[PDB]
Design an enzyme around this catalytic site. Sequence first.
Site, PDB file in Angstrom:
ATOM      1  N   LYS A  18       5.210 -18.325  17.353  1.00 42.17           N
ATOM      2  CA  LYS A  18       6.214 -17.756  18.246  1.00 42.17           C
ATOM      3  C   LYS A  18       7.654 -17.853  17.767  1.00 42.17           C
ATOM      4  O   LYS A  18       8.466 -16.968  18.045  1.00 42.17           O
ATOM      5  CB  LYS A  18       6.090 -18.400  19.627  1.00 42.17           C
ATOM      6  N   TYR A  87       8.676 -28.573  -0.976  1.00 46.77           N
ATOM      7  CA  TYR A  87       7.271 -28.306  -0.635  1.00 46.77           C
ATOM      8  C   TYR A  87       6.418 -29.571  -0.750  1.00 46.77           C
ATOM      9  O   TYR A  87       6.454 -30.262  -1.767  1.00 46.77           O
ATOM     10  CB  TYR A  87       6.693 -27.202  -1.540  1.00 46.77           C
ATOM     11  N   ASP A 131      11.343 -39.272  18.511  1.00 43.79           N
ATOM     12  CA  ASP A 131       9.889 -39.168  18.439  1.00 43.79           C
ATOM     13  C   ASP A 131       9.417 -38.534  17.126  1.00 43.79           C
ATOM     14  O   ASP A 131       9.839 -37.429  16.754  1.00 43.79           O
ATOM     15  CB  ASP A 131       9.323 -38.403  19.655  1.00 43.79           C
ATOM     16  N   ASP A 149      11.884 -32.395   8.274  1.00 42.20           N
ATOM     17  CA  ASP A 149      13.116 -32.023   8.955  1.00 42.20           C
ATOM     18  C   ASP A 149      12.855 -32.065  10.455  1.00 42.20           C
ATOM     19  O   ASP A 149      12.252 -31.138  11.004  1.00 42.20           O
ATOM     20  CB  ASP A 149      13.519 -30.602   8.536  1.00 42.20           C
TER      21      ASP A 149
END
Length: 254
Positions: A18, A87, A131, A149
């Site tokens: 989304k 990566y 968290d 990130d």
Amino acid sequence: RQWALEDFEIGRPLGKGKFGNVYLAREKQSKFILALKVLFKAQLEKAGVEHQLRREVEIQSHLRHPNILRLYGYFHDATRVYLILEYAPLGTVYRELQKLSKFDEQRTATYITELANALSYCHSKRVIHRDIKPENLLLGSAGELKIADFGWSVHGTLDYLPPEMIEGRMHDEKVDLWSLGVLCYEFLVGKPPFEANTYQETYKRISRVEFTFPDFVTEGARDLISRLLKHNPSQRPMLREVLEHPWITANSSK
């Protein structure tokens, strides 16, 4: 007039959702392999306000540590924002957990050591996370842990939130010590300590710090986790005390 999409070659889709997609990519000139996170503007501004997910590129970009995923930079166009990421070839700690069911003491202690180191570095930079879940922990080429990130998901649950945060009260750097405890437990047991059938019962357990150990968990492990999951933030240890804990030093490979 700097980094641009034309500077890159696009590879297979790492994730679609989304909020955008993530792809494997390679810089044309250099030909180095990396990841490109593509976010739709029509979502950032709409809800996840660009505000929250913006300057955090400059702060995140300034984080340079072996156990923190590197954010090389970013750029945008009319409809999208592009994040140039390091990566991580071996996937997430989450998938590895699905595979092995649960980790052993040596692997758990090493992972906690790598996390405590990244977090200590972040604290020195006045950066605190909110968290950290297994799905946000990626694995490098040598198998080392990389804290991804924080933020920018493409599409963290209640199970990983400390009491002071779900209760609405004040929270600080000590929130990271609580996270360390939930993870240590999850690595050794296979599931987070406050898991329940309803958000209701989960909150209750987190709030009242209600957790128990299966018979196989060691006294050394039980002692560390117990020191970390303290309702009162001030009672939680400093990151240095975790790196020097006898159970960590005894099972960790550094």
